[PDB]
């Protein structure tokens, strides 16, 4: 359905340990928030030098645009987002419905 993509840069002084702690917390929102169905992440390993300072990507899966909105309004999201966003330099969010060249 709808993929919720967040790209991030962790601020100076955020440890690798705090990053893995934060990522486990973000992923836990699957469990805490009904509409969020799955969570995957990655550290950038590109070679093109086009990452624009972002180092990580987080993708969460939803069944609809309305489900993403419910997630954003959910008090567990609002609480955790303060924690997570507090450790970021850069953030970028895009939501899309995966489309392909299909018949």
Which of left, alpha, beta for 40 (phi over 0: left; psi -120 to 50: alpha)? beta
Residue 77 beta carbon to its own copies: minimum distance, rounded to whole angstroms: 11
> What's the CA gap between 88 and 102, in Å, rounded?
38
Whether 54 is catalytic? no
Strands (DSSP E) along 37-87, which ranges? Answer: 38-43, 56-62
Residues that bind its own copies (CB under 8 A): 2-5, 7, 23-24, 27-28, 38-48, 50-52, 54, 57, 59, 65, 68-69, 72, 91-101
Residues 51, 54, 56, 74: which is the catalytic one? Answer: 74
Read off the tokens for 103.
């018949």
- Active-site residue identified among 4, 26, 71, 77: 71
For residue 12, the minimal CB distance to its own copies (Å) is: 20
Per DSSP, what are the bridge partners of residue 56? 8, 43
Q: Report in angstroms how near the CB of residue 85 gets to its own copies at its nearest.
A: 10
């Amino acid at each position: 359905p709808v993929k919720h993509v967040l790209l991030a840069s962790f601020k100076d002084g955020v440890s690798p340990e705090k990053i893995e702690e934060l990522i486990k917390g973000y992923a836990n929102l699957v469990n805490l928030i009904e509409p969020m169905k799955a969570f995957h992440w990655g550290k950038d390993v590109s070679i093109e030098n086009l990452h624009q300072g972002y180092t990580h990507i987080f993708e969460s899966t939803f069944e609809s645009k309305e489900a993403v909105a419910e997630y954003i309004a959910h008090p567990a999201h609002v609480e955790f987002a303060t924690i997570f966003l507090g450790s970021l330099d850069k953030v970028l969010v895009i939501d899309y419905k995966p489309t392909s060249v299909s018949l």
